[PDB]
Enzyme design. Structure first.
Site, short mmCIF file in Angstrom:
data_model
loop_
_atom_site.label_atom_id
_atom_site.label_comp_id
_atom_site.label_asym_id
_atom_site.label_seq_id
_atom_site.Cartn_x
_atom_site.Cartn_y
_atom_site.Cartn_z
N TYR A 26 0.81 -1.20 0.00
CA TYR A 26 0.00 0.00 0.00
C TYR A 26 0.86 1.27 0.00
CZ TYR A 26 0.91 0.71 5.04
OH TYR A 26 1.52 0.98 6.25
N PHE A 36 1.78 9.71 3.22
CA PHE A 36 2.10 9.67 4.64
C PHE A 36 2.76 8.34 5.01
CE2 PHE A 36 -2.61 8.88 4.29
CZ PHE A 36 -2.74 7.64 4.88
N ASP A 37 2.63 7.31 4.18
CA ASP A 37 3.30 6.02 4.44
C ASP A 37 3.13 5.09 3.25
OD1 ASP A 37 4.87 4.40 6.26
OD2 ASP A 37 3.29 3.00 6.21
N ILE A 56 -8.40 0.10 9.90
CA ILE A 56 -9.51 1.03 9.88
C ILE A 56 -10.67 0.44 9.07
CG2 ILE A 56 -8.21 3.16 10.36
CD1 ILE A 56 -8.10 3.68 7.20
N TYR A 82 -9.89 7.74 10.70
CA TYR A 82 -9.50 8.19 12.04
C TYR A 82 -10.41 9.29 12.65
CZ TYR A 82 -5.49 5.40 10.91
OH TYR A 82 -4.68 4.34 10.53
N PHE A 99 -5.87 5.44 -0.41
CA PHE A 99 -4.87 4.38 -0.35
C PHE A 99 -4.76 3.70 -1.72
CE2 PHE A 99 -3.53 3.64 3.98
CZ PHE A 99 -4.48 4.30 4.73
C1 LIG Z 1 0.66 2.37 9.96
C2 LIG Z 1 -0.30 3.52 10.30
C3 LIG Z 1 -0.41 4.58 9.21
C4 LIG Z 1 -1.19 5.78 9.86
C5 LIG Z 1 1.02 5.06 8.90
C6 LIG Z 1 -1.12 4.00 7.98
O1 LIG Z 1 -0.58 4.08 6.87
C7 LIG Z 1 -2.56 3.44 8.05
O2 LIG Z 1 -3.48 4.24 8.20
N1 LIG Z 1 -2.87 2.13 7.88
C8 LIG Z 1 -1.87 1.02 8.02
C9 LIG Z 1 -2.05 -0.04 6.93
C10 LIG Z 1 -3.46 -0.56 7.06
C11 LIG Z 1 -4.41 0.63 7.02
C12 LIG Z 1 -4.23 1.67 8.11
C13 LIG Z 1 -4.60 1.16 9.52
O3 LIG Z 1 -5.53 0.44 9.72
O4 LIG Z 1 -3.76 1.50 10.49
C14 LIG Z 1 -3.87 0.96 11.82
C15 LIG Z 1 -4.71 1.95 12.63
C16 LIG Z 1 -5.22 1.49 14.00
C17 LIG Z 1 -6.64 1.91 14.31
C18 LIG Z 1 -7.65 1.27 13.74
C19 LIG Z 1 -8.89 1.77 13.78
C20 LIG Z 1 -9.11 2.91 14.40
C21 LIG Z 1 -8.10 3.55 14.99
C22 LIG Z 1 -6.88 3.05 14.94
C23 LIG Z 1 -2.43 0.79 12.35
C24 LIG Z 1 -1.80 -0.37 12.12
C25 LIG Z 1 -0.59 -0.59 12.60
C26 LIG Z 1 0.02 0.34 13.31
C27 LIG Z 1 -0.58 1.50 13.54
C28 LIG Z 1 -1.80 1.73 13.07
#
Ligand SMILES: CCC(C)(C)C(=O)C(=O)N1CCCC[C@H]1C(=O)O[C@H](CCc1ccccc1)c1ccccc1
Length: 107
Positions: A26, A36-37, A56, A82, A99
């Protein structure tokens, strides 16, 4: 909600099910194109299990619409991401996330 727009088609038959591990590449961007990542920059796929509530809500919902091999752009409303918190320092409050997701494998 989440809007799924295809970049490259998948096989059209192998869609992820609850309890399966989705292996994805991704790149996450803000609506203005700012990255952002990206796991593609780390060259290591990201793994998550569908239905386990660890990603998410726009991901659980969007990637479940994808067949193995497919590359799609998922536009996710803040309430499916978020919300009003945002992710401290990375995502602002109330942000729409974009994404670019490729579903590589199901394990
Ligand atoms: C890695 C984090 C970030 C911001 C750089 C990113 O690219 C992101 O948004 N991602 C990570 C890759 C999967 C999608 C999303 C996520 O679910 O993150 C989860 C979020 C956790 C969560 C879920 C639901 C509601 C609130 C918070 C995540 C995974 C791993 C580490 C940190 C965050």
């Amino acid at each position: 909600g989440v809007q799924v727009e295809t970049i490259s088609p998948g096989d059209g038959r192998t869609f992820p099910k609850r309890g399966q591990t989705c292996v994805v590449h991704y790149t996450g961007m803000l609506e203005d194109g700012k990255k952002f990542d990206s796991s593609r920059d780390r060259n290591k796929p990201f793994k998550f299990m569908l239905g386990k509530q660890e990603v998410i809500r726009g991901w659980e919902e969007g990637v479940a619409q994808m067949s193995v091999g497919q590359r799609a752009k998922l536009t996710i409303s803040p309430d499916y991401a978020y919300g009003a918190t945002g992710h401290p320092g990375i995502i602002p409050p109330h942000a729409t996330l974009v994404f670019d997701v490729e579903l590589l494998k199901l394990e």
